[PDB]
Design a protein around this ligand. Sequence first.
Ligand SMILES: NC(=O)c1ccc[n+]([C@@H]2O[C@H](COP(=O)([O-])OP(=O)(O)OC[C@H]3O[C@@H](n4cnc5c(N)ncnc54)[C@H](O)[C@@H]3O)[C@@H](O)[C@H]2O)c1
Ligand SMILES: NC(=O)c1ccc[n+]([C@@H]2O[C@H](COP(=O)([O-])OP(=O)(O)OC[C@H]3O[C@@H](n4cnc5c(N)ncnc54)[C@H](O)[C@@H]3O)[C@@H](O)[C@H]2O)c1
Ligand SMILES: [Ca+2]
Lengths: 277, 279
Amino acid sequence: LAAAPVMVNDCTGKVGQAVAEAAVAAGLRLVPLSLTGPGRGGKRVVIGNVEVDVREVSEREDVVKEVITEYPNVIVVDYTLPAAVNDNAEFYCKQGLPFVMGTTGGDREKLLDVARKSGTYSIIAPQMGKQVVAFVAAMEIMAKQFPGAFSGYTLQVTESHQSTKADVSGTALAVISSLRKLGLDFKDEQVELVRDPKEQMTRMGVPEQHLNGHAFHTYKIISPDGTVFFEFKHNVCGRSIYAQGTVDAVLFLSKKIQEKSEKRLYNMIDVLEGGSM
Amino acid sequence: VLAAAPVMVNDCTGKVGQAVAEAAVAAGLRLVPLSLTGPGRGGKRVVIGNVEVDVREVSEREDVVKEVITEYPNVIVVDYTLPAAVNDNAEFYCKQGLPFVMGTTGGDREKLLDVARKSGTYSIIAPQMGKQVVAFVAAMEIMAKQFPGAFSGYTLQVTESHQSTKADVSGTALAVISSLRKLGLDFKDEQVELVRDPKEQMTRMGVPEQHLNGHAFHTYKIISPDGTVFFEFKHNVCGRSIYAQGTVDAVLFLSKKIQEKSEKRLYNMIDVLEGGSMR
Ligand SMILES: NC(=O)c1ccc[n+]([C@@H]2O[C@H](COP(=O)([O-])OP(=O)(O)OC[C@H]3O[C@@H](n4cnc5c(N)ncnc54)[C@H](O)[C@@H]3O)[C@@H](O)[C@H]2O)c1
Ligand SMILES: NC(=O)c1ccc[n+]([C@@H]2O[C@H](COP(=O)([O-])OP(=O)(O)OC[C@H]3O[C@@H](n4cnc5c(N)ncnc54)[C@H](O)[C@@H]3O)[C@@H](O)[C@H]2O)c1
Ligand SMILES: [Ca+2]
């Protein structure tokens, strides 16, 4: 590939590891340095056939000078923790480092502000499963073109995630928001969170190996008389969809940088519009 | 409050025509108590809700329409007849200046749309009136054009159930598959799995036993190369009510366009969806 090399912070996190493995398998160059979180020690990890020197976040200035002098065209991929989001972003923007930020949480308004204001080439997208982004944006296209089209219908929404998210998924909320414009009446509190593993397996169909990394959503829309039934599901096991979307985002941003686009801040919709590469 | 034109349903004795009239009445549209039935059917009085409809032979259609027009000048005609009557009924409506909603399938569809456009008659010609199904279809296509190859590498299975003897993939399924191809799925029309065994229609598609001869259940499954991502979309229709309810909406939409004197005369069900809910 004519694509920029990538530094994945943190390649020891669950999604960060998946991204790095997918980047390597795809034929991107993985920078053999990574930054891990506060309270984690230095270590050597194997990603494919690449040995990555994982360094403490206290060393991040030194580490980035080293990455920048050896890999000037580097793009950083950030899958860290909500706590690090705005700080990592300000760090990348101050250093002129182009980045793909997949980490959720943080102050999303300040995040987008700093990236746009500095004019740093970036993709900031809290859902990098691009196929899920396409479904979300379909529901919203439907919602914009055809307001009230399901007026009078009943909505049920059910979803399953690791019991490390007490909360309704951002994806579910965004879809429900479109469904309201389609004339459904449904409060966020009505989402049915499935959190029992027995039930996640036996009723939602989540495989036993994926109980701690999955995102299963079901939306049902039923007419007042019960004769019309619509059902939409998007069920993700593990993290490969996030990994594969991140690779595409890096390939897209690579090109924008090579071309010197006027536009600097992109999202996953922009990536989807460009097609598969 | 609806404030809509009164409707004449031809033929209120046909299966879909009756369903439309009953749904119109229950919704609070005014049903004109005259209807036209097909050649070889006799005159009769039918009850639609608590409205007694004088069903007249199609040979009397000149007399019938003069009677409807003098009591209900703002009438909109809803046509659910038979492929054989489509082009003739349409030419009749356009000659008389009667606005119409044509739900009947078949006929020469090019001549049909030509006569309506040429005469400048307010009309909705839509061979699929299940508006919620139309909205889903049209979304998928917009999505598909916006996001080319987005599911490139994924596998597609398509299953659908209809009354026995449907040999051909539903026009709705084909249109959705066509969008799915633009999203990078590689899938021939022949690979649609027609479910036609009633045991299987019930046990596997969920079709209720009473609806085995009148239903349209579709399932689209999209799976990633590694098998870890599964998308499933279903749209399942039992009987005729979705067509009835969409016809009411079409009449409400056309009513408004007529009241406003739109420059545009010939509309379809996409145009109705774009106009929003009116109930
Ligand atoms: N965009 C998406 O599609 C998507 C999908 C899944 C998860 N996520 C999000 O991505 C993030 C990571 O999820 P996960 O399941 O990989 O969690 P994880 O805890 O396994 O990994 C996060 C890693 O980040 C490290 N870290 C913390 N602060 C850091 C810093 N300042 N610099 C470098 N590394 C730091 C931690 O030590 C940890 O190993 C979460 O915010 C999660 O919500 C996003
Ligand atoms: N747009 C849609 O989505 C949709 C949905 C369901 C059915 N349909 C179509 O609607 C049509 C009617 O279906 P159905 O089950 O009600 O048919 P049906 O056989 O039950 O009734 C049709 C009626 O039309 C009458 N008729 C024939 N010629 C006529 C004329 N010149 N004027 C007045 N009446 C006349 C017949 O006597 C008959 O009773 C079919 O072509 C069918 O494909 C369309
Ligand atoms: Ca009869």
